[PDB]
């Protein structure tokens, strides 16, 4: 339950979430928890443009997710997660951040490679099977992390 973000960020979250989110309480709770669990992530609001051209200001959480120093070869991916205004009824959506990143620094051996489309959107299995009543933002990033991980050593 320890909070890693400073007061200015908590107050900011309080402020920006209110006007946008159908369920501000859950969005605030899940966003704060995410930031507290993944210290490389930061929040901002940005305009997301929908498929039909409609722009919508949304909370976005961004940063570089990296495998831990656990003896395995390190892998990192810069991502941008968007929280839709109907969260958690609707799932977040996540893309690779294409600044200073070449999507081709990701081994085809990495399980995550399979889920990244030509446009940079990451179709994580958890998002496809989203359960509004049982899932949160942390679980999304945890799955992302588990797919970045070097696949286990075998003896073949």
């Amino acid at each position: 339950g320890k909070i890693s973000v400073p007061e200015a960020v908590v107050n900011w979250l309080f402020k920006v979430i209110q006007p946008i989110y159908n369920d501000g309480r859950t969005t605030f709770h899940d966003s704060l928890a995410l930031l507290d669990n993944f210290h490389s992530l930061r929040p901002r609001t940005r305009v997301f443009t929908h498929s039909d051209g409609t722009p919508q200001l949304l909370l976005s959480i961004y940063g570089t997710i990296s495998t831990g120093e656990d003896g395995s070869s390190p892998h990192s991916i810069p991502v941008i997660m968007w929280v839709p205004s109907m969260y958690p009824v609707k799932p977040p959506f996540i893309s690779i951040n294409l600044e200073n990143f070449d999507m081709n620094t990701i081994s085809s051996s990495l399980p995550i490679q399979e889920y990244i489309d030509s446009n940079g959107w990451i179709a994580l299995p958890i998002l496809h099977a989203w359960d509004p009543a049982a899932m949160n933002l942390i679980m999304v990033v945890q799955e992302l992390m588990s797919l970045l991980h070097e696949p286990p050593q075998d003896q073949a």
Binding site: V9, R46, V47
Partner: peptide, 8 residues
Amino acid sequence: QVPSDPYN
């Protein structure tokens, strides 16, 4: 509101 960023 317009876009904002407590870090930038």
